[PDB]
Ligand binder design. Structure first.
Ligand SMILES: CC(=O)N[C@H]1[C@@H](OP(=O)(O)OP(=O)(O)OC[C@H]2O[C@@H](n3ccc(=O)[nH]c3=O)[C@H](O)[C@@H]2O)O[C@H](CO)[C@H](O)[C@@H]1O
Ligand SMILES: [Cl-]
Ligand SMILES: [Cl-]
Ligand SMILES: [K+]
Ligand code: NA
Ligand code: NA
Length: 360
């Protein structure tokens, strides 16, 4: 039997949740009828298959006080309309604020709703949103989480919670026996905000051996609020870092790069620590709040440092850059994890969850 699956997401931007949704939609869209409802107009940053149907809600004004109030109500009822008129067998929403909007908008309708979390629960800070999450999430039909820790957190007040790892689209594009001729290249890939902490990357570079700073390229791929302030820090520290902005061909960076650094305080299941597995990129990561050891076995397939510890990051960087055989050992061991994120097995566990929710 074919199922009509409608995803709901705020935008189809470059974020990691969007990357996961597009991979899921593309995998499901040939056997099943897949549609996406998004709150804002625009073309998908990630390439979406032609069978996936995309609709955007109507856009509204938010410039005057009247419109700042009336358009919030119009936006909610535009979503309720799109759900009413949808002939989906199941709704699947992405990201907490969107999950909450879908739970409220779906009140009284009968299509079941699966909500999907794409961060650690601790990432949501304001007490009012944590309250709304606490009171609305019990009314979903199922919740997908990214780690066992968030599973136990949510399971306390949500009936059906399932741990679903994210599929990586590189698992179907890069052959497992690929060889790479690496350059003296170090990457930071991610949004430039406080949580991602790119300043830790810059400070670590300034502490590297002269010998390394002059013979290595350090690349920041991504954009965000902190872009301008980071370029000043680069000047003030007297280092050479190349800001590429937001790049569409991250594959070319991964192919040439020896090392990637993640400096976040809080992550769900960081995509760059998965994508690196398929290109023999050595992973150095802060011990972001809670899931880091689920992706890196320290000194076996990668290296962990304390949060906000730019000195430790520099030493770990020097440890693999001054010892290529040790770096090669880490990335060889990391290859055993490539099978954990194949699209095929994760797609079927989503289909199992959809069937379990449709049969209740
Ligand atoms: C703070 C947080 O919880 N973030 C979570 C959120 O991911 P994020 O929203 O924080 O983004 P991410 O870092 O996990 O991935 C961003 C993605 O876009 C990429 N990219 C980046 C720069 C660029 O120039 N070009 C480009 O394509 C990239 O290679 C990638 O797949 O959702 C993910 C999937 O659930 C993970 O759970 C993340 O941990
Ligand atoms: Cl992003
Ligand atoms: Cl007004
Ligand atoms: K970005
Ligand atoms: Na995201
Ligand atoms: Na990431």
């Amino acid at each position: 039997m074919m199922m009509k699956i409608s995803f709901i997401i705020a935008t189809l931007n470059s974020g990691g949740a969007e990357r996961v949704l597009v991979t899921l939609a593309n995998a499901l869209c040939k056997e099943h009828e897949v549609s996406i409802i998004k709150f804002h107009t625009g073309e998908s940053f990630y390439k979406l298959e032609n069978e996936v149907k995309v609709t955007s809600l109507e856009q509204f004004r938010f410039d005057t006080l009247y419109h700042k109030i009336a358009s919030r109500f119009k936006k909610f009822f535009a979503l309720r309309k799109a759900l009413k008129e949808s002939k989906a067998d199941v709704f699947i929403s992405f990201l907490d604020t969107t999950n909450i909007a879908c739970i409220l908008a779906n009140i009284g309708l009968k299509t079941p709703l699966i909500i999907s979390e794409h961060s650690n629960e601790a990432y949501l800070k304001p007490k009012t949103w944590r309250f709304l999450r606490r009171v609305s999430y019990p009314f979903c039909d199922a919740l997908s989480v990214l780690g066992s820790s968030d599973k136990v957190y949510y399971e306390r007040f949500v009936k059906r919670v399932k741990l679903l790892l994210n599929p990586c689209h590189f698992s179907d594009e890069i052959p497992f026996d690929s060889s790479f001729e690496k350059e003296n290249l170090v990457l930071f890939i991610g949004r430039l905000d406080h949580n991602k902490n790119p300043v830790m990357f810059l400070k670590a570079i300034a502490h590297l051996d002269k010998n390394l700073q002059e013979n290595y390229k350090f690349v920041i791929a991504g954009d965000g609020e902190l872009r301008q302030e980071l370029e000043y820090k680069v000047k003030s520290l007297g280092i050479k870092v190349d800001f590429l902005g937001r790049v569409e061909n991250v594959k070319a960076l991964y192919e040439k790069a020896k090392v990637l650094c993640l400096c976040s305080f809080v992550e769900g299941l960081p995509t760059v620590l998965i994508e690196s597995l398929y290109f023999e990129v050595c992973r150095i990561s802060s011990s972001y709040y809670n899931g880091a050891k689920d992706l890196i076995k320290d000194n076996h397939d990668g290296l962990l440092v304390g949060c906000d510890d730019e000195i430790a990051l520099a030493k770990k960087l020097e440890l693999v850059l001054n010892d290529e055989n040790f770096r090669k050992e880490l990335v060889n061991n990391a290859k055993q994890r490539c099978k954990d994120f194949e699209i095929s097995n994760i797609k079927e566990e989503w289909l199992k969850l959809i069937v379990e929710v449709k049969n209740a």
